[PDB]
Design a protein that fits this description.
The structure is cut from a larger assembly and holds two copies of chain A (about 200 residues).
Chain A: H1 4-10, H2 21-43, H3 45-48, E1 51-52, H4 59-65, H5 72-82, H6 84-104, H7 112-140, E2 150-153, E3 162-165, H8 169-199
Antiparallel strand pairs in A: 1-3, 2-3
Helix pairs in contact in A: 2-5, 2-8, 5-7, 6-7, 7-8
PDB class: cell adhesion
Keywords: ion channel, alpha helical membrane channel, two double layered lipid spanning, cellular adhesion, Cell junction, Cell membrane, Deafness, Disease mutation, Ectodermal dysplasia, Gap junction, Hearing, Ichthyosis, Membrane, Non-syndromic deafness
Entry title: Structure of the connexin-26 gap junction channel at 3.5 angstrom resolution
């Protein structure tokens, strides 16, 4: 039930008129599509085929870890999770508060645009706070903007400075580009919607 | 026929009165005894059990070589060969020239002490030139006065700086002591005989 249901409350009935309402969510899907291709496919090798040229027991495990602390596809994953949260917390705040107020004063819209159009504005703030909180780590945490073919790893139990080699570090980067590019694009659409709610107040 | 025959001409009939005439040759034997124990025994392992912690093909061979250019027991060997040469060149110069002059003027001793007691003086000079030519290398060539348990070897085809380990580097040193000690002792006896031929001219 991953994807189809997030839209049942996420693709809301009638919120705003900016052409960036759907665009942002079409990417949100696209972006979980690209990642549900990367993960199971290109990262299985991450640890397996990660070769350190040393016989020194400790080394290889330590050389992956010291070098791949939260692997990319679990970062990418966390991103899509956190940036998924505001989207579904709001949609949850709506289908609850709207269903509540309605069926309670029917037997016995200034607060529909008040309460909900307001938390939605802070959501859009949250979206770009996350989309950019990770976009940050993904760029600061991981030794530049991509990964090299080999790394020179000083992990503790290696003898001095050893070599190690990653698996498909280009295919791995390729997918770090797209997912980082779409991570920027999905930042602007988010900030354009935070801009449109700063224009008319 | 190694050792017994070198004395048949080396342990000459009646040359000088210093108590260092035999002493020096008793060591010469002792010193080939200690080496004919070391060699076949402690150095076989030199290359075999020389372990470099790397998977990198070229490395181990290059790490022995860059580190053991002329192995100790072949140096020790060369020593005993070169410092053996003056001893047997003189003894050869005698048993020839003495047999010659004798059987030629019998049918038809100022030159026995002239020619031979003179080349023997330059021999003693040669002995200590060699005994000290190697004693020099053996101390300058080989990274201090002994060998460590492990070496950090930068041999070309190793990845960066790798470890390697020697075999019995103490037993190996132990025998480098004795053979270097006796290499010094056998220097002094040689220089005392060059001294006694500098005292009375």
């Amino acid at each position: 039930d991953w994807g189809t249901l997030q839209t049942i409350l996420g693709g809301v009935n009638k919120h705003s008129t900016s052409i960036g309402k759907i665009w942002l969510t079409v990417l949100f899907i696209f972006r979980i599509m690209i990642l549900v291709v990367a993960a199971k496919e290109v990262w299985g090798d991450e640890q397996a085929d990660f070769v350190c040229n040393t016989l020194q027991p400790g080394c290889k495990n330590v050389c992956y870890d010291h070098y791949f602390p939260i692997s990319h596809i679990r970062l990418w994953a966390l991103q899509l999770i956190f940036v998924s949260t505001p989207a579904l917390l709001v949609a949850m705040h709506v289908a609850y508060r709207r269903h509540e107020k309605k069926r309670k004063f029917i037997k016995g819209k200034v607060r529909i645009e008040g309460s909900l159009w307001w938390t939605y504005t802070s959501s859009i703030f949250f979206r770009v706070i996350f989309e950019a909180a990770f976009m940050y780590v993904f760029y600061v945490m991981y030794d530049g903007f991509s990964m090299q073919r080999l790394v020179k790893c000083n992990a503790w139990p290696c003898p001095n400075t050893v070599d190690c080699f990653v698996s498909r570090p280009t295919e791995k980067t390729v997918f770090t580009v797209f997912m980082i590019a779409v991570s920027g694009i999905c930042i602007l659409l988010n900030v354009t919607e935070l801009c449109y709610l700063l224009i008319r107040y």
